[model samples]
Target chain A: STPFFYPEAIVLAYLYDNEGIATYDLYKKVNAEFPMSTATFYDAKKFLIQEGFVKERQERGEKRLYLTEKGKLFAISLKTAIETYKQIKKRHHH
Target chain B: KSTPFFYPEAIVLAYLYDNEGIATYDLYKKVNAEFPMSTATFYDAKKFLIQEGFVKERQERGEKRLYLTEKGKLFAISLKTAIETYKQIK
Candidate 1:
């Protein structure tokens, strides 16, 4: 598998926080924060789905996205890394 | 535009993180073996790492070597941890 990009990271992080979010809702929220083109957004979404890190399901006639078990672990790992990175940066400033 | 961290950068950083100080030529060879890219692309990745203050170059015995900065070491460690965790689940 290829290395994931920043947009993928953003998607994972968002899904990690807001589990079972509607696909359209997710797209709107993520784009509002990251400001990427529609094509880029869908590309990132497609990558996540293809990699098995994310899955889409129909719920109440709406498409919802959820993370796989592996995706949850991966997202947690990323969260830990980001927190560690922030702490290191803080320590360096002093 | 935000700088995207792709596999090429990750491969280079992770290798340097593990190997510590290594010859530039040797590093290029190893990194290429893992992720094939043009010489120009490899240099571009190297330039990004240096510009971001994650790596530095030193001349020793007529050979140029690369080493991670203290900040780079910590960041690379975190990245390595994350990758390993992901791999474990995979």
Candidate 2:
């Protein structure tokens, strides 16, 4: 597995804490919230699916998908990781 | 944008190594070691665990205590791995 990247983790967190809703709408949602460029959001979403951390679905004319059990687990892990990493990283800065 | 991904576990592990075990009181000293966290922060984290189904704890004879749930333990390991990755980044 690639060293867990932050963007990948972010995408995973949103899915895990919430139900698995994997779709381009999510990409669009994140695109607006995070500072990443368009390319970054797209790639982040794709990386999650390819990595098996996120499962996708295709709705009939709904144009949205969701993640799976594995993805939820991954998301929780990422969330926990972020909580730990963020505080420590800032500690060094101080 | 910045978050500590492994801290609750790292702080918990650090405490276990030094203090032998954890309890409700354990959280305060451990939590403040890393952040200038307020009491509310401590209460909120504990409350979330109760409310959010993040983990389970055993309260013994009026002793307030907490530990990694099966899911929590898995997350702790994941948090440990993330910390290792963060170190590798450095």
Candidate 3:
């Protein structure tokens, strides 16, 4: 099983890819792929904030979310780990 | 329920990554020290790891010890790197 929930990883990856994005846009993009309830999405967001993996700020009357330094490191490492795992699995299958 | 700072599974994998061939008893203490959890919870995580083929238990000197499978070792090393990076950044 994955350490992070699917939605949580999706949120982190999205935030890491974008320097910073409007909260609404982030939510829309993630929801488009995962199709979770608003409450569930925010719950994932809340966990990220509580864990210090993400931070939000108000910019021009909009809220934007971005990964903190720690978050960036985490997202990158996690992605690397996942890719490595996939490669190992593929090789084992052949 | 309170959200755990680190998942028990992650903690377990990271611990095994660094300290391979740790006896089950010793591993329990070490994991509990870092993240307070009941024996039940720890064993539950262990069972899941074994079920998922990430870990194996062996009889060593009349004691059961744990070791990561090939895939588990690679995955755990990556996770350990992530944890180390997280700590350094924090």
TM-score (C-alpha, index-matched) for candidate 1: 0.77
Q: Model 2 over residues B1-90: C-alpha lDDT tens digits? A: 233333332434323332323676766776676444566656656665544333456786577766554434433555556444444433
Candidates, DockQ: 0.44, 0.08, 0.43
**iRMS for all predictions?**
4.2, 9.2, 3.3
Query: Scoring model 1 with DockQ, what do you get?
Result: 0.44
Question: Chain A TM-score per candidate?
Answer: 0.75, 0.63, 0.73
**Candidates ranked, most accurate by lDDT first:** 3, 1, 2
Off by over 4 Å in 3: A1-10, A24-37, A50-52, A58-62, A82-94, B1-5
Fraction of native contacts under 8 Å reproduced by each candidate:
0.59, 0.14, 0.48
Q: Give the interface RMSD of candidate 1.
A: 4.2
- Sort by TM-score, best first: what order? 1, 3, 2
Number of the top DockQ candidate: 1
Which clashing pairs does model 3 show?
Answer: none
- What is the TM-score of each predicted model, taking all chains together? 0.77, 0.42, 0.76
lDDT per residue for candidate 3 within A54-86, as digits (tens), equals: 998998788889888778878887666555655
